Amino acid sequence: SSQLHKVAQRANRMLNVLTEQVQLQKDELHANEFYQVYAKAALAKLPLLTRADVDYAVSEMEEKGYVFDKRPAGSSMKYAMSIQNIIDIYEHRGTPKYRDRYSEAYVIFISNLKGGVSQTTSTVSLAHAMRAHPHLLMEDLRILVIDLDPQSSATATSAQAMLQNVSREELLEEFIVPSVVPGVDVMPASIDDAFIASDWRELCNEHLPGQNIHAVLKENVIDKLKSDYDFILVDSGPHLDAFLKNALASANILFTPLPPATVDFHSSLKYVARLPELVKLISDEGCECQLATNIGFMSKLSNKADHKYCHSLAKEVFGGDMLDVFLPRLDGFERCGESFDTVISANPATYVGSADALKNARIAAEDFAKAVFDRIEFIRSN
Amino acid sequence: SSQLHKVAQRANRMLNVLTEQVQLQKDELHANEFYQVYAKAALAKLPLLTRADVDYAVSEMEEKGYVFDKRPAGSSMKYAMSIQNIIDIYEHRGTPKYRDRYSEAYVIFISNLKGGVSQTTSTVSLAHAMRAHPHLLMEDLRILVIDLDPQSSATATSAQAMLQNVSREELLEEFIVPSVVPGVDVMPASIDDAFIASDWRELCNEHLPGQNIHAVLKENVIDKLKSDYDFILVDSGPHLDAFLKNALASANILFTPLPPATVDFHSSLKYVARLPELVKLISDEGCECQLATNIGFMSKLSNKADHKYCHSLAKEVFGGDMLDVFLPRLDGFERCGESFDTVISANPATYVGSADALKNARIAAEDFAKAVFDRIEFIRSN
């Protein structure tokens, strides 16, 4: 009957409602459960396709080739084109696929600076996006995401396949798994891989002696699959030193995600600085494989939409027992210390970063500070 | 001489410049190295203080009490008032301190849903903010942050002090440490505490038999310090079950940080729902200590200032080898799967969350997707 109990019960109801909804909306989902499609006229606005050159062309396939889906609207019949459907029209329309202008598989190594497997989702996310891209469909590309980044709370093995030697067909039937999006395949990793990585030197000599501890990824796994995929995304980081060296040793191009926070950024830079040093050692101990580029990009972690939605639900649950002051991001500016250096200690003349980023933080941290003090007073007194 | 090497070298220079700057700006910093101060007329705009009632009043302290700081400006002499200075004027001005209207110490338990010690910095940050608050100075409050949340990459022990029984004076000289901000003290924690927590039952019977495994925090540590602090912030989470139950058992009011992401939010709700269940068990096995409230708030992780600054430095390093498309937050919407459910698989009719949050994600994930494909083509071809 207490305030803490009441809000706890609303929170419980809130959970139920979310649970029931996902139910009601998912049984018609398992009536297919695989993906999404395009209309008819929709294909018009797509690349090398025009209303007619397809509309009147599909009418030909339909009765001298295969099928397509549909559902009415009264006196109107709508189509549902799959990514395979579309990939086919481009086929019958003669437009060459990415596989046609390039023979082998291009390897992209997306480094993971953060020590969270949370990067496996974004990577596969990247792959699903480069396959379902409205203007990339005409390429019918085979993307394989090799996950070589194990984790914990965040979180058929790539590290396993590496140690053994299953030849092509084996890697294909025993290790690679198909994701929800058809063109993309994953070669997963487990918390166990960390131990393989930890003892990569010993575990090597044994399971595969005479091998270059760094070529293992390339040779024992990539080389055998290069004719079966257009893009092979390798997912790894500097924490698993061995898998990192193997990934470089197997990468054509490499992408480095930059953190949008001063302290994590500094680190990033450190890593961008060490790569040449590593890449060198990798040729000096074995294969002079050319790692040429290092393209960069900035990651994000916001989505105002999500913040707003979440906010709203929070208010529905806590009602009036929810401060209208948010708690700022308080840790990517000045490390914590020896003593304890908050954004509050930070002297804006001593700080070598974004003076505004620091101002804003403190201001909000104070605003939060006072709001806390007050809801306290009001509670202590009354 | 390669692109990867060049950018790596800029990154190295960038690091140096940041390193040198912090030097040049820190030796005059160790000429004090402790904190920041207020001007003279500044105290005017503060609470119970007016230009005169202080200006002409300090002139009295100055020659019949103690000191204050200064530094000229030609024909003008400026003052530098410390938080102690100000706390004193309020003293001589007779305005009562928080210690005067409340005898014991009020305990605030800030729960940590995330499994990262990163919460210790924000907590101490909260404390430093409730002490240096322009309109809270007049309270001269003694805040003690008991850190009972150990970690790893993120990261005299509170868990130790708990198991033993150092009486007041001991806790004060042997365990509690002063932070950069004078009024705030911390009772730190180590990765070792996790093991104490893991085996709290056995480690209890031994080091302190007959005790209520849940009252240990309250009795053996808080009770002895309640007259020496106004606010005692307890930092812990649901991962260290034992420390969690001890914190509740020792809390008057409790704050719950809500994550601004649909998946992490759901969890939060789960926890807000379980508290009454836990709080109950805590009285049934021992002390019927009243945990009344559960105030809520939303956390943040953005700081556009920081993103911009960091962005800028990234461009200085990578120049033109840095996509002008950012990578979206791709994981707080629909869990990864069994197969691999990205925001790209997510059917916007099946998704029970913020439909816009999901739209935006996908849109950007595609934009990133294409930009990736292109810088690739341009590199493969030319």
Tab-separated table of N, CA and C in Angstrom, chain A residues 91-172:
chain	number	residue	atom	x	y	z
A	91	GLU	N	17.128	-9.998	-62.600
A	91	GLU	CA	17.785	-11.125	-63.250
A	91	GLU	C	17.247	-11.277	-64.652
A	92	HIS	N	15.925	-11.329	-64.749
A	92	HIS	CA	15.269	-11.470	-66.036
A	92	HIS	C	15.461	-10.224	-66.885
A	93	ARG	N	15.679	-9.098	-66.219
A	93	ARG	CA	15.887	-7.826	-66.884
A	93	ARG	C	17.340	-7.731	-67.323
A	94	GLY	N	18.107	-8.796	-67.083
A	94	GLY	CA	19.503	-8.850	-67.490
A	94	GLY	C	20.561	-8.031	-66.774
A	95	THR	N	20.170	-7.194	-65.804
A	95	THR	CA	21.124	-6.343	-65.058
A	95	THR	C	22.073	-7.201	-64.213
A	96	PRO	N	23.390	-7.087	-64.440
A	96	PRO	CA	24.404	-7.868	-63.708
A	96	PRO	C	24.493	-7.658	-62.201
A	97	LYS	N	24.702	-8.752	-61.482
A	97	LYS	CA	24.795	-8.721	-60.034
A	97	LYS	C	26.238	-8.439	-59.589
A	98	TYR	N	26.416	-7.957	-58.355
A	98	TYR	CA	27.752	-7.636	-57.828
A	98	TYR	C	28.706	-8.819	-58.059
A	99	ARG	N	28.153	-10.019	-57.944
A	99	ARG	CA	28.918	-11.246	-58.143
A	99	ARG	C	29.563	-11.272	-59.536
A	100	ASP	N	28.943	-10.591	-60.496
A	100	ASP	CA	29.424	-10.552	-61.874
A	100	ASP	C	30.612	-9.645	-62.142
A	101	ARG	N	30.682	-8.498	-61.467
A	101	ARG	CA	31.792	-7.574	-61.671
A	101	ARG	C	32.984	-7.819	-60.734
A	102	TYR	N	32.848	-8.755	-59.787
A	102	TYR	CA	33.926	-9.094	-58.820
A	102	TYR	C	33.888	-10.587	-58.509
A	103	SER	N	35.023	-11.269	-58.669
A	103	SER	CA	35.078	-12.716	-58.425
A	103	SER	C	35.150	-13.173	-56.952
A	104	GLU	N	36.229	-12.824	-56.258
A	104	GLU	CA	36.375	-13.210	-54.861
A	104	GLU	C	35.472	-12.431	-53.881
A	105	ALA	N	35.700	-12.637	-52.591
A	105	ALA	CA	34.918	-11.970	-51.567
A	105	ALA	C	35.746	-10.863	-50.941
A	106	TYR	N	35.138	-9.693	-50.787
A	106	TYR	CA	35.828	-8.559	-50.188
A	106	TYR	C	35.634	-8.637	-48.669
A	107	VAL	N	36.737	-8.605	-47.923
A	107	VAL	CA	36.687	-8.670	-46.462
A	107	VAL	C	36.704	-7.306	-45.748
A	108	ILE	N	35.700	-7.060	-44.914
A	108	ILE	CA	35.614	-5.816	-44.154
A	108	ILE	C	35.783	-6.085	-42.655
A	109	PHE	N	36.839	-5.571	-42.037
A	109	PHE	CA	36.998	-5.791	-40.610
A	109	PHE	C	36.517	-4.641	-39.725
A	110	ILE	N	35.318	-4.762	-39.162
A	110	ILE	CA	34.795	-3.728	-38.275
A	110	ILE	C	35.309	-3.925	-36.856
A	111	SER	N	36.324	-3.151	-36.478
A	111	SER	CA	36.908	-3.267	-35.145
A	111	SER	C	35.942	-2.833	-34.062
A	112	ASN	N	36.082	-3.475	-32.907
A	112	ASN	CA	35.236	-3.218	-31.754
A	112	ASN	C	36.076	-2.727	-30.608
A	113	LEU	N	36.042	-1.421	-30.380
A	113	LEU	CA	36.828	-0.824	-29.315
A	113	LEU	C	36.186	-1.095	-27.966
A	114	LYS	N	34.862	-0.972	-27.924
A	114	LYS	CA	34.110	-1.253	-26.703
A	114	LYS	C	34.265	-2.761	-26.406
A	115	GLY	N	34.241	-3.136	-25.131
A	115	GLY	CA	34.366	-4.543	-24.769
A	115	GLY	C	33.007	-5.191	-24.543
A	116	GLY	N	32.062	-4.904	-25.439
A	116	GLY	CA	30.714	-5.450	-25.355
A	116	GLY	C	30.328	-6.081	-26.686
A	117	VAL	N	29.778	-7.293	-26.628
A	117	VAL	CA	29.390	-8.031	-27.830
A	117	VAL	C	28.312	-7.279	-28.595
A	118	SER	N	27.812	-6.211	-27.978
A	118	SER	CA	26.768	-5.381	-28.569
A	118	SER	C	27.130	-4.988	-29.998
A	119	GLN	N	28.383	-5.216	-30.376
A	119	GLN	CA	28.811	-4.881	-31.720
A	119	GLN	C	28.381	-5.934	-32.736
A	120	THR	N	28.115	-7.152	-32.272
A	120	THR	CA	27.671	-8.194	-33.183
A	120	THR	C	26.316	-7.858	-33.800
A	121	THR	N	25.431	-7.239	-33.023
A	121	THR	CA	24.107	-6.843	-33.500
A	121	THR	C	24.178	-5.731	-34.526
A	122	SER	N	25.013	-4.729	-34.270
A	122	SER	CA	25.123	-3.634	-35.218
A	122	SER	C	25.782	-4.150	-36.504
A	123	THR	N	26.811	-5.006	-36.398
A	123	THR	CA	27.461	-5.555	-37.595
A	123	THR	C	26.446	-6.293	-38.454
A	124	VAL	N	25.785	-7.290	-37.880
A	124	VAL	CA	24.764	-8.009	-38.625
A	124	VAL	C	23.776	-6.963	-39.090
A	125	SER	N	23.529	-5.964	-38.259
A	125	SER	CA	22.616	-4.922	-38.690
A	125	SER	C	23.168	-4.281	-39.991
A	126	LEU	N	24.465	-3.991	-40.021
A	126	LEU	CA	25.062	-3.398	-41.203
A	126	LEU	C	24.765	-4.324	-42.372
A	127	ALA	N	25.097	-5.608	-42.225
A	127	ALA	CA	24.856	-6.572	-43.303
A	127	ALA	C	23.394	-6.619	-43.751
A	128	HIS	N	22.458	-6.688	-42.819
A	128	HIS	CA	21.077	-6.722	-43.262
A	128	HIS	C	20.718	-5.485	-44.040
A	129	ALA	N	21.363	-4.366	-43.724
A	129	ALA	CA	21.091	-3.095	-44.402
A	129	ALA	C	21.689	-2.998	-45.819
A	130	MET	N	22.827	-3.652	-46.026
A	130	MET	CA	23.496	-3.668	-47.318
A	130	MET	C	22.909	-4.746	-48.236
A	131	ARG	N	21.843	-5.384	-47.803
A	131	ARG	CA	21.266	-6.447	-48.582
A	131	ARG	C	19.859	-6.055	-48.947
A	132	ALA	N	19.174	-5.415	-48.012
A	132	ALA	CA	17.804	-4.989	-48.213
A	132	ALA	C	17.779	-3.561	-48.678
A	133	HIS	N	18.933	-3.024	-49.067
A	133	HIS	CA	18.926	-1.634	-49.499
A	133	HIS	C	18.219	-1.482	-50.829
A	134	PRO	N	17.154	-0.662	-50.858
A	134	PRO	CA	16.360	-0.409	-52.068
A	134	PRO	C	17.225	-0.272	-53.320
A	135	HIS	N	18.355	0.416	-53.204
A	135	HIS	CA	19.230	0.617	-54.348
A	135	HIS	C	20.452	-0.297	-54.379
A	136	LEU	N	20.377	-1.426	-53.689
A	136	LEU	CA	21.481	-2.379	-53.691
A	136	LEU	C	20.944	-3.765	-54.043
A	137	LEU	N	19.612	-3.897	-54.045
A	137	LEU	CA	18.949	-5.168	-54.352
A	137	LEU	C	19.500	-5.784	-55.637
A	138	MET	N	19.603	-4.949	-56.661
A	138	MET	CA	20.114	-5.344	-57.970
A	138	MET	C	21.521	-5.959	-57.932
A	139	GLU	N	22.073	-6.152	-56.740
A	139	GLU	CA	23.421	-6.688	-56.622
A	139	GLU	C	23.428	-8.109	-56.115
A	140	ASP	N	22.299	-8.530	-55.544
A	140	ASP	CA	22.157	-9.877	-54.984
A	140	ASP	C	23.505	-10.246	-54.364
A	141	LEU	N	23.781	-9.674	-53.192
A	141	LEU	CA	25.056	-9.918	-52.526
A	141	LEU	C	24.983	-10.877	-51.354
A	142	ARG	N	26.005	-11.720	-51.280
A	142	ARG	CA	26.105	-12.749	-50.262
A	142	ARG	C	27.035	-12.280	-49.154
A	143	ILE	N	26.440	-11.834	-48.050
A	143	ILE	CA	27.196	-11.335	-46.907
A	143	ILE	C	27.296	-12.356	-45.772
A	144	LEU	N	28.518	-12.609	-45.341
A	144	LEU	CA	28.755	-13.500	-44.232
A	144	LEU	C	29.424	-12.707	-43.086
A	145	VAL	N	28.773	-12.659	-41.923
A	145	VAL	CA	29.304	-11.969	-40.747
A	145	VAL	C	29.987	-12.986	-39.855
A	146	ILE	N	31.299	-12.953	-39.795
A	146	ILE	CA	32.027	-13.866	-38.938
A	146	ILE	C	32.155	-13.180	-37.575
A	147	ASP	N	31.440	-13.688	-36.574
A	147	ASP	CA	31.539	-13.105	-35.242
A	147	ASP	C	32.723	-13.673	-34.471
A	148	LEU	N	33.703	-12.834	-34.193
A	148	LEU	CA	34.868	-13.261	-33.469
A	148	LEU	C	35.039	-12.344	-32.264
A	149	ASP	N	33.912	-11.996	-31.650
A	149	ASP	CA	33.899	-11.127	-30.489
A	149	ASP	C	32.953	-11.644	-29.408
A	150	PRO	N	33.478	-12.457	-28.471
A	150	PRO	CA	32.707	-13.030	-27.360
A	150	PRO	C	32.508	-12.006	-26.235
A	151	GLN	N	31.457	-12.179	-25.430
A	151	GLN	CA	31.187	-11.263	-24.310
A	151	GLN	C	30.476	-11.874	-23.089
A	152	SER	N	29.835	-11.038	-22.265
A	152	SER	CA	29.152	-11.547	-21.067
A	152	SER	C	27.673	-11.154	-20.913
A	153	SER	N	27.383	-10.180	-20.046
A	153	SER	CA	26.002	-9.737	-19.824
A	153	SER	C	25.373	-9.394	-21.179
A	154	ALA	N	26.116	-8.632	-21.981
A	154	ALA	CA	25.662	-8.247	-23.307
A	154	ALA	C	25.206	-9.523	-24.014
A	155	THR	N	26.171	-10.395	-24.322
A	155	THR	CA	25.916	-11.676	-24.997
A	155	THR	C	24.866	-12.521	-24.253
A	156	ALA	N	29.637	-24.634	-33.633
A	156	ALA	CA	29.218	-23.604	-34.582
A	156	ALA	C	30.013	-22.304	-34.399
A	157	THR	N	31.167	-22.393	-33.742
A	157	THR	CA	31.993	-21.220	-33.466
A	157	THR	C	33.065	-20.892	-34.490
A	158	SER	N	33.218	-19.597	-34.762
A	158	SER	CA	34.214	-19.115	-35.712
A	158	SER	C	35.615	-19.488	-35.240
A	159	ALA	N	35.844	-19.385	-33.933
A	159	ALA	CA	37.147	-19.722	-33.364
A	159	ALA	C	37.372	-21.222	-33.473
A	160	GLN	N	36.289	-21.996	-33.370
A	160	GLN	CA	36.369	-23.454	-33.487
A	160	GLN	C	36.711	-23.819	-34.932
A	161	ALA	N	35.867	-23.366	-35.853
A	161	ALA	CA	36.083	-23.633	-37.258
A	161	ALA	C	37.528	-23.287	-37.610
A	162	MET	N	38.056	-22.228	-37.019
A	162	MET	CA	39.428	-21.825	-37.283
A	162	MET	C	40.470	-22.864	-36.859
A	163	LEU	N	40.305	-23.393	-35.649
A	163	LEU	CA	41.236	-24.379	-35.112
A	163	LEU	C	41.228	-25.706	-35.839
A	164	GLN	N	40.049	-26.122	-36.293
A	164	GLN	CA	39.911	-27.377	-37.022
A	164	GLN	C	40.313	-27.157	-38.497
A	165	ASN	N	39.437	-27.494	-39.435
A	165	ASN	CA	39.767	-27.291	-40.835
A	165	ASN	C	38.677	-27.774	-41.747
A	166	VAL	N	37.468	-27.852	-41.200
A	166	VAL	CA	36.324	-28.276	-41.988
A	166	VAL	C	36.480	-27.608	-43.358
A	167	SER	N	36.428	-28.374	-44.435
A	167	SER	CA	36.573	-27.751	-45.743
A	167	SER	C	35.233	-27.211	-46.221
A	168	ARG	N	35.313	-26.117	-46.967
A	168	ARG	CA	34.162	-25.412	-47.502
A	168	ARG	C	32.805	-25.985	-47.090
A	169	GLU	N	32.384	-27.047	-47.775
A	169	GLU	CA	31.092	-27.712	-47.530
A	169	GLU	C	30.786	-27.898	-46.047
A	170	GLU	N	31.824	-28.196	-45.273
A	170	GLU	CA	31.666	-28.400	-43.839
A	170	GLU	C	31.367	-27.080	-43.136
A	171	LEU	N	32.173	-26.064	-43.436
A	171	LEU	CA	31.962	-24.745	-42.860
A	171	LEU	C	30.537	-24.331	-43.187
A	172	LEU	N	30.110	-24.653	-44.405
A	172	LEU	CA	28.778	-24.300	-44.879
A	172	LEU	C	27.604	-25.012	-44.240
